[PDB]
């Protein structure tokens, strides 16, 4: 039958296993081409390469030998400095760019052929900023850990020019995790209302900290911005009286979603977690959540589009792919229910601004849903 | 004699003439190659290519057309993704790269191989916040254009948290040039004492809808994070009352420096500004200047190791290069007084921390020095 | 038929074509005879002569010329030392003495044969001064330019002895332009309030002195006392917040009177204005408007006189003129629409003290009419 | 020997004698040829005409007439307009233009051949500033008659601005001669320093209404803006605590001047004046000492002339005067003691800018000098 390529730029783990959005990739491939009404007749295969994620040039003497061999799509690095090396490739040479990840695309920057699965700080930051208003306060902080992390913010940093916010913005201590000086003068300034702009594995070790500084009680409320807030364990803070509030775009209501984290918590396997972490066992990170939407997505445009072939393609000798216009314009014309729910695209640029949140907060029984955002909508937070 | 390859990656203007950075690299290496004193025996060749500085697969194309001919080192592209991607051709194979232009250090980015002679932010944005303690501000707004200037300003930005400052932060409207909507809600919000993340471009175009506005007034106080304010037509503001405070890096009260900005203006004399701008005509850019400093920066580091000679590197057949590893030693570890001070490196990373500013600002004769800013001592302002 | 001789005495312009008073005087001669139910058998011919203007010796003699060859009326020079030489000819010799424009009238003259079709300033200053009380100043400064602004806003000066103004009073720069050292006593004295007796030729070049002196904010309020307000270039100041009051004669809603206007920008077409003026290009002047009134209210007179003759007057073997008596009283008793509304005069003098006045200001739009002013009537600003 | 012919242009008195300044012309050429060491051989003929001195016209055909016949010199109507159509012939045809009178001189007229022999009120006007000063007034009301008398006095009016005055601008009630409404207004508005800006004649007819209102006490000071003070009839004001300060130029002091005086009320001796006045019987005017210290002036500059030919010229067939050229230059050159002190033009302009005068005030004697104002020193009052 035929046989359509993919191709994938994931990081170099040296000694443990493969990363969590390598095996999502594995997994979604190798569910597709074994379900029949997904791609009745088509085989993907994929030609998965590793790289160190900070080195440009490695991912794009990585991109051209994929390139060289022949790929339908790149399903691209996971790492701002890499991604965009690997971008203007994809777009001198006509092949989509597939990425799971956000980074900062520059303002002045002509580039076509990519799209990102990932939400939208454009959008996600709107969504914090509508909590900071149902919610009712009027003095926040918001700490990030990378200066990355003030564009991701700024659409909550850019108003208090709007409205009545007094923000106060600290940073998390570089080259180092104790942030216990940050946490003391938190606590001596009064700073109860407080917004983290974290990953989901910094989220939960400064949240240790703050219950060491006593700064778990009734009086201090926790807004978080990471899609993974879902996946710590929060057993220690169940009981004392903090407010927790996130988001998560991983529709974890779904009976379809849910049995393919079953799957996944079952059928990896590898690579346990440590103990004394939190950030439980059983779980999809929402790194991962994305890549297994990226190869289905992608799926929905390969069979909207026939005889479509593989060429190998060359980045000394340039020429552009043929296909490589139309089915372009297939992948952001492409509607998908995912696991991360709704997947559309916004036909300017290739973001996820208008996508499907349900904003979940702590109670004393754990994680519980309390509301739904939407672009179109706002707050449902009706519980 | 021996011969000496530079390497050069410019900005591809089409129908005008080649760029500010790129005549002054051609003017650098004309200046010593005619002098004796410094480099007696060594005739300075360069190799400078043209790319659209949005492409980060053509610049990584014309950066292995310089290896492969042969470079000591690569002056670069001048923005923030097509630098990253020769910084990492450089790193890998081991030649210099030299850049003139900010950008944002990705955190864990292990490269060696590259100095950057524009005066970092982490220092510059504390010369400002040195200003609105001197003028004993309470209340500021900080004013940006692309979201890259959150990175640029946020030892600005995270102190309220330390001092008793009170931050409005605004961005200019993407997409057009009229900043007057903005101009509204800064003069209704009573937004007296303003900074302007700008290009002297931008920052020229906006005192005119700030006149218009009639915001240039005896109320008004604006601070330029720009080191070209002194390359500003400010004769329709000199009798307003207004405060316009700034830097300037550009030493022009040498006899040395202001000879060569003399001989600026008449040898090219190509490009005649545009007449209602504003932003006058015989003047050196602060890109320009860096770019006539950073071919001299280098001519220290080949008259302190002769022996060297030019190899013709491979990206494909990949093997480092051979003088690199110390040539890059002598690079950071060079002193020089160019037209832009002292030129000093910063050992951990290729960055000037250390320099000399000199705070100038508007009087009713012009612009005048009021004083100086150093990192070591502050602001010595005595005027 | 019938043909019927005027006079004209105008401004010498060496280089350039000829002045705004004589097209219009050319322009309404055209307009009449082309026109059959104005003037229906009646073939208005002219001898238009040119004079330096400050010369009365030379008005004389211009006066006499057409006196020998034999007028109907003398529609006069256009300053006061030379109007004055040739009304004493005109009321000797028995001939009207058509007046466009402001002169003194001392208070002994006994003179008969003069209109005058200029707003006099003992009714034009009562609109100033309802201004200044409409608007609650309590401090006003006046600027006028020549020492004969005095005499015409007389009646603005002496009431500080009525009302509770205090009044203090400012004269423009002799042998120069540069208004910059009066306008700087007046920020410093705190004069936000301010009449300027000006032409509309020096109201405007001290508007861009008052814009570099920052004094153009939402502050300062400007009356203007010159009726051509509505032909300054006032996009520079529309959005500056200042308020620009002033008033407008000329009828400029009506259908027939802007189709006229209308004609005239496109017939004359000649001596393009300076483009770094202000003072923009489609207008006409109250001093033309004025000119082209003149003609039509002396047509208005020899409608209702037929059998009249030129005769030739002669000034040395001085004898009166036979018809000028009756149709001097004609002249004083018509009535007439022109481009400057209402035309009728006093029965006492020769001077329109009744006219209709439109109290015009500054918006975010440009000039916008905000009432209306009437000798009887008063103040109706009810926009 | 040598005639020399004047021309003197005068007021029609018809029932009456000549007036003041005709006898005063007549009484100057009788004594010049009379006396040996001032014009030894020059016999001083004159060719007086009279005019109504309100008719530019009839003024315009006299001073033709005289230099039809041929005269050196125009002695000059004195009234402003009428004497600004004979100053335009002087002008033209190359004579002399003696002025003995204040006239505006429009600001843009192109006149040389003109001399004015009355003090400016430039200079004059800064001396009444000079009172108001050294008498320590903060409040002062000036009081005019005609609306000429604003450009008289607008150094007086446009000082607010500078020192700490605060002015009160009056004016006589036109078309009578009871100032009784005026003065109750001053009376009930508290204004006891007055400046008058009136003739002599004024001046004494509103201090008998100032003395029927009970306005003659100690409490008020009047400072009369007229140089004729001196020839007021102070007997009823003399008791009455009221001081009354002024000027004098007329040199009463020196031994030569007070003769010619005592020989001005001996030989003349017509026209006795209305004894219900007051206004004393023997005195010169003013006007009448500078119609007898214009002669002087100009016949120093016929001393300094020699082979000085009278021409014949027409106003017709134009053609200038051929030693006027010189001639004007000698009478702008002269000094002369007259009745009126020191005598000298000022070169830029025919004004008498430089004078000497002397402050006369009220004491319980009469009229008495009590200090000299001079433009170079200023108040020397040390009585
Ligand atoms: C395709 O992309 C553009 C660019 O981001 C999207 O336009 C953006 O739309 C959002 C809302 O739909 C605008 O954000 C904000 O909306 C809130 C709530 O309605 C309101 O406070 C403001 O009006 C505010 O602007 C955003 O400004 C706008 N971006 C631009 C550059 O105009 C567009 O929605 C996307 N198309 C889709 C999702 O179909
Ligand atoms: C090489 O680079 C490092 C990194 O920039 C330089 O260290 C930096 O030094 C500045 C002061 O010179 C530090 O800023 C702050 O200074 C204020 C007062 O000036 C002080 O109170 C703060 O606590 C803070 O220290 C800056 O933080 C620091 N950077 C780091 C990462 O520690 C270093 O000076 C350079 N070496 C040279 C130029 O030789
Ligand atoms: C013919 O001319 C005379 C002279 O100008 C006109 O008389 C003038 O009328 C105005 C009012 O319309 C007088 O102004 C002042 O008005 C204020 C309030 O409006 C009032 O309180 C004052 O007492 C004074 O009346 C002006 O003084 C007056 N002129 C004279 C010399 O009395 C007359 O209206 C003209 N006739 C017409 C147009 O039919
Ligand atoms: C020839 O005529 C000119 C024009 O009037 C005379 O210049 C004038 O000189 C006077 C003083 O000499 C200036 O007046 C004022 O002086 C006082 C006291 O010194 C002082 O407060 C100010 O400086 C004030 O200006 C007057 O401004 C000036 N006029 C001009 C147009 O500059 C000149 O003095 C005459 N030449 C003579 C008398 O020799
Ligand atoms: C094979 O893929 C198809 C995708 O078209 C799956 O069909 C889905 O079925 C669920 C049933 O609840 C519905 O949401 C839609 O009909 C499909 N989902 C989509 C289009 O997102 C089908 O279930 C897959 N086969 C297996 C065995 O899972
Ligand atoms: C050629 O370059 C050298 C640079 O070393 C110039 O020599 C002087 O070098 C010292 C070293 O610090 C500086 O302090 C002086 O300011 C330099 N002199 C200058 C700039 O005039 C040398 O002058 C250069 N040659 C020419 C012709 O300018
Ligand atoms: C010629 O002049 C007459 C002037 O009377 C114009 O006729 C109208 O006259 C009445 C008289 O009051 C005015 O109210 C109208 O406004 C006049 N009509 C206008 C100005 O259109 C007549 O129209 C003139 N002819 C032309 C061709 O304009
Ligand atoms: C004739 O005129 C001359 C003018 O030169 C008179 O001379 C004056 O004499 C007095 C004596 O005190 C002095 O002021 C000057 O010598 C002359 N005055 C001037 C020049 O102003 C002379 O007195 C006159 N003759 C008679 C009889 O009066
Ligand atoms: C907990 O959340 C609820 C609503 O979500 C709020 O009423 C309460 O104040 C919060 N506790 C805090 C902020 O300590
Ligand atoms: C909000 O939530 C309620 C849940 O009761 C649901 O019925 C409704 O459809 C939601 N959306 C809107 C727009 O109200
Ligand atoms: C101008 O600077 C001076 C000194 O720093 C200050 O007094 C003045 O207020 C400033 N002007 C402003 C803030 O408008
Ligand atoms: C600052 O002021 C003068 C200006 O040149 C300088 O000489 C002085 O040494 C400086 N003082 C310091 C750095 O303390
Ligand atoms: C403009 O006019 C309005 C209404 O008369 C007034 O409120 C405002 O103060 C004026 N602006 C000034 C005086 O600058
Ligand atoms: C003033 O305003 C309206 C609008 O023109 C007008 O109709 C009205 O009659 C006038 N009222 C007066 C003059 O009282
Ligand atoms: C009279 O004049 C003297 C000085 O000339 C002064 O002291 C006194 O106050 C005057 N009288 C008044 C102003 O009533
Ligand atoms: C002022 O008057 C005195 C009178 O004693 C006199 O001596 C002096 O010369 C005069 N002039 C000046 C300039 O002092």
Redesign the pocket.
């Known amino acids: 039958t035929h046989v359509l390529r993919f191709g994938g730029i994931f990081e170099y783990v040296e000694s443990g296993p493969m990363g969590a959005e390598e095996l999502a990739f594995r997994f979604a491939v190798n569910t597709i081409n074994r ?4 791609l009745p007749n088509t085989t993907l295969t994929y030609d998965t390469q590793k790289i160190n994620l900070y080195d440009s040039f490695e991912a794009s003497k990585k991109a051209c030998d994929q390139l060289s061999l022949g790929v339908a799509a790149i399903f691209g690095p996971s790492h701002s400095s890499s991604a965009n090396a690997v971008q203007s490739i994809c777009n001198a040479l006509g092949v989509p760019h597939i990425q799971t990840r956000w980074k900062h695309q520059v303002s002045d920057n002509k580039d076509s052929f990519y799209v990102s699965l990932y939400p939208d700080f454009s959008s996600l930051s709107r969504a914090i900023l509508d909590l900071v208003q149902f919610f009712k306060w009027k003095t926040v902080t918001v700490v990030y850990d990378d200066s990355t992390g003030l564009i991701r913010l700024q659409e909550l940093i850019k108003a208090p020019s709007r409205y009545n916010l007094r923000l106060k913005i600290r940073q998390l201590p570089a080259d180092t995790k104790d942030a216990k000086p940050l946490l003391k003068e938190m606590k001596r300034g009064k700073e109860f209302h407080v917004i983290f702009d974290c990953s989901h594995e910094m989220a939960a070790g400064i949240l240790k900290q703050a219950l060491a500084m006593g700064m778990m009680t009734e009086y201090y409320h926790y807004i978080f911005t990471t899609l993974d807030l879902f996946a710590l364990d929060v057993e220690p803070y169940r009981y004392s009286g903090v407010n927790m509030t996130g988001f998560r775009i991983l529709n974890t209501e779904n009976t ?1 979603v849910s049995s393919i984290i079953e799957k996944w918590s079952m059928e990896r396997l590898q690579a346990p977690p440590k103990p004394d972490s939190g950030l439980l066992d059983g779980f999809m990170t929402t790194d991962a959540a994305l890549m297994y939407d990226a190869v289905h997505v992608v799926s929905v445009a390969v069979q909207q589009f026939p005889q479509m072939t593989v060429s190998s393609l060359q980045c000394n000798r340039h020429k552009p792919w043929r296909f490589g216009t139309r089915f372009m314009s297939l992948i952001k014309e492409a509607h ?3 696991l991360t729910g709704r997947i559309t695209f916004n036909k300017t640029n290739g973001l996820r601004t208008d996508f499907d949140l349900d904003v979940i907060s702590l109670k004393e029984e754990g994680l519980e849903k309390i509301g739904t955002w939407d672009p179109a909508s706002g707050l449902n937070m009706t519980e």
Chains 1, 2, 3, 4 share one sequence.
Not at 35 to 38: D, F, G, P, V
């Open positions: 379900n029949r009404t997904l379809q998908w229910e995912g």
